[PDB]
Amino acid sequence: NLYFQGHMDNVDELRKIENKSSFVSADNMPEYVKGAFISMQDERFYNHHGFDLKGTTRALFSTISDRDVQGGSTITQQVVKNYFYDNDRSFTRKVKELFVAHRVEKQYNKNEILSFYLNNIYFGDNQYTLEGAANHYFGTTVNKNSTTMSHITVLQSAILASKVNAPSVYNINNMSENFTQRVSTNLEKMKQQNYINETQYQQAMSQLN
Amino acid sequence: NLYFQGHMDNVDELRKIENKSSFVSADNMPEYVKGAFISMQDERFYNHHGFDLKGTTRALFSTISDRDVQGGSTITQQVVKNYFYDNDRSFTRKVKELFVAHRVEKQYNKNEILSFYLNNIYFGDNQYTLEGAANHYFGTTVNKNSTTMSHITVLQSAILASKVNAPSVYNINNMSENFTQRVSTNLEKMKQQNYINETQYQQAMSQLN
Amino acid sequence: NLYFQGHMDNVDELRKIENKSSFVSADNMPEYVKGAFISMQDERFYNHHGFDLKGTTRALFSTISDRDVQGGSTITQQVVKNYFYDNDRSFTRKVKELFVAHRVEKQYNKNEILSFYLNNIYFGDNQYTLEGAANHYFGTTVNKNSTTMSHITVLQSAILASKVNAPSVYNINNMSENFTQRVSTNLEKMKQQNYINETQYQQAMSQLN
């Protein structure tokens, strides 16, 4: 995927992701597909400006519970980190990613960011786009208009949204109990955030079981 | 171990650890067993209020030596992290664990905390309690009253206290040089902190060699 | 390598690295050998006092680009971390390493520090010195005076400088695409920092390809 990585001399370098053959715009995806990723990675994605300082602070200080605590990276931060060439993880690189995230949010709307996200992160088996992965893993499609191809299910969406946390380890064919827990949590959060309903939720929990 | 994990709506969720079949109270353990864990994880456990700010600061700024520097998590922090469902490690989750640790210290005494610790952390091979591990690995017991079962040795205590830092990697049967170094350091610290004496120390160093 | 590790009661403990059989002083190495490590780990090594606060801050805030951002550890910090016994990585240990780095910079000149670096970090296959590794991996030597032995090439220097980031994983014989990317970047930085020229750069890129 080196061609679709760089140093970010200008944020318009991300536009080159649009020329991938399996590129699919966020606009062209079903909501529950997008919400699988949003719910699992950065629930207030549409609301914040790349950092989610307010919501992070509430989830921390408002309840004793960890119910609202999320992972350490908003989707916008993840897009920066994945556009930058692969490198060792450190505080100094994280901070640069935060700085650049602000520049990405300044230039692009949430759907463009989300499109750069889903079409340039690693899903396993050499797939750096969400359509390549769905096709490869399930032979399904995340284009909501297709009349040609089976549409990605709720479960399969959750599976891919959880998978990108450890794409080389989490194995779709032989799912570990931990990968299974991750996906279960993803589904529940898709339900709580109203991307799916009880029926879908139960159908997906059944399929997973 | 999912049943004995949760979101901590209330700190009294930890009391459910008490119903594990192999539950053994800290009160019912030999001191050198407890000190194996305390010495290796959080020496001033009994003295601090969950954070060890004072002692951490001295170990840092008082001597050039690293002799008094410890790991990044007090036993109380470890109990929170292990009660929370398995999740990716991040700054935002660490901070929530610190917040909740303060609530745990407010409610419980040190022996209750230590009991929640030793009976709900992972020791390897599907063992989430210190008695299950001792029984499984050594066929020994950490109940100081048993007249029925061989009592866990000093070495075996150090081995398990070091093991929980990387329970899936550190292998009791075929010990790596690093695991071996960890255990050696544990024994020395058990000696320096007066949980064991020279005799015990040397007997354990002999057995390890 | 335990003998050449310790608690740093005094910074003069590092002088014992000088008695290693394959010890080679930085003074006795070709510049491009040293620059392979400097360029890849800490470009302003000679200029800063162990922390590189100024340059780190510029690389962060001056350009949107990540072009000048480096890894999270100056060579002096790396020498401390590697002199200290192997231990779990944490914020509290990192901070102690920073404190001691300042004491190392106070006592020693840059060539002594660089000599402690290259002669006590892990290169793979049981090699804790740069000469042991060059001899073992390539049968070459980093002593610039040798009339006896083939001299380490530009490529081989970059390979070893990148290798110490993950010495047990990066494999010289069967190089992963990532290890390959690391080395490529190292060479380019050796060129940009004027340790090598275009000819050398291209010869090394050819050999690597």
Swiss-Prot record, chains A, B, C:
Keywords (A to Z) from UniProt: Cell membrane, Cell shape, Cell wall biogenesis/degradation, Glycosyltransferase, Membrane, Peptidoglycan synthesis, Transferase, Transmembrane, Transmembrane helix
GO molecular function: peptidoglycan glycosyltransferase activity
GO biological process: cell wall organization; peptidoglycan biosynthetic process; regulation of cell shape
CC annotations in GO: outer membrane-bounded periplasmic space; plasma membrane
Catalytically driven reaction(s): [GlcNAc-(1->4)-Mur2Ac(oyl-L-Ala-gamma-D-Glu-L-Lys-D-Ala-D-Ala)](n)-di-trans,octa-cis-undecaprenyl diphosphate + beta-D-GlcNAc-(1->4)-Mur2Ac(oyl-L-Ala-gamma-D-Glu-L-Lys-D-Ala-D-Ala)-di-trans,octa-cis-undecaprenyl diphosphate = [GlcNAc-(1->4)-Mur2Ac(oyl-L-Ala-gamma-D-Glu-L-Lys-D-Ala-D-Ala)](n+1)-di-trans,octa-cis-undecaprenyl diphosphate + di-trans,octa-cis-undecaprenyl diphosphate + H(+)
Pathway: Cell wall biogenesis; peptidoglycan biosynthesis
Top-level division of the source organism's lineage: Bacteria
Subcellular locations according to the entry: Cell membrane
Enzyme class: transferase
Function statement: Peptidoglycan polymerase that catalyzes glycan chain elongation using lipid-linked disaccharide-pentapeptide as the substrate.
Protein family membership: Belongs to the glycosyltransferase 51 family.
Name listed for the protein in its UniProt record: Monofunctional glycosyltransferase
Species per Swiss-Prot/TrEMBL record: Staphylococcus aureus (strain MW2)
Gene name of the encoded protein: mgt
